[PDB]
Structure formats: structure tokens, C-alpha cells
């Protein structure tokens, strides 16, 4: 079997073959995050006795 093969040819075509493949993969991922916080406190007191 190893010397003469597992199969033999019964018919077919003896022509040439041209197979072209153009595989293109593109990926893009973007993530933006902005956080800003402001606080303000203002307090005063006046007391006078005369």
C-alpha cells in the first residue's frame, strides 16, 4: 500500500489552476472619558454690640 498508494486515478483533468485569495482584516476601537467637578463654599459672619 505504501509503495503503490491507497488509490489510483480513473479520470480527471490535466489543466492548470490559478487560485488567488485576498484576506483583509481591520479593526478599530476608541474610548474617551472626561470627568470634571468643581465645588465652592463661602460663608462669613459679623456680630457687633455697643
Amino acid at each position: 500500500i505504501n509503495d503503490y498508494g491507497t488509490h489510483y486515478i480513473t479520470s480527471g483533468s490535466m489543466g492548470g489552476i490559478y487560485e488567488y485569495i485576498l484576506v483583509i482584516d481591520k479593526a478599530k476601537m476608541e474610548s474617551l472619558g472626561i470627568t470634571s467637578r468643581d465645588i465652592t463654599t463661602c460663608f462669613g459672619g459679623s456680630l457687633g454690640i455697643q
Partner: protein, 32 residues
């Protein structure tokens, strides 16, 4: 390709004021 950016900004302020207006005047010779 890789790209990253980070910005930070912090500002702090604290005012303070403290008046003191006190006067003494007395007259009943005697004077103050």
C-alpha cells in the same frame, strides 16, 4: 497602533477676613 492621553487640573483657593471695630467713649471733670 496604540495611543492614550490623560489630562488633570486642580485649583484651590481660600479667602479670610476678620474686622474688629470697637470704640469706647465716656463722659459723666472726668473724660474717657
Amino acid at each position: 497602533e496604540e495611543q492614550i492621553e490623560a489630562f488633570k487640573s486642580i485649583i484651590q483657593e481660600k479667602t479670610s477676613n476678620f474686622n474688629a471695630a470697637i470704640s469706647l467713649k465716656f463722659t459723666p471733670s472726668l473724660h474717657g
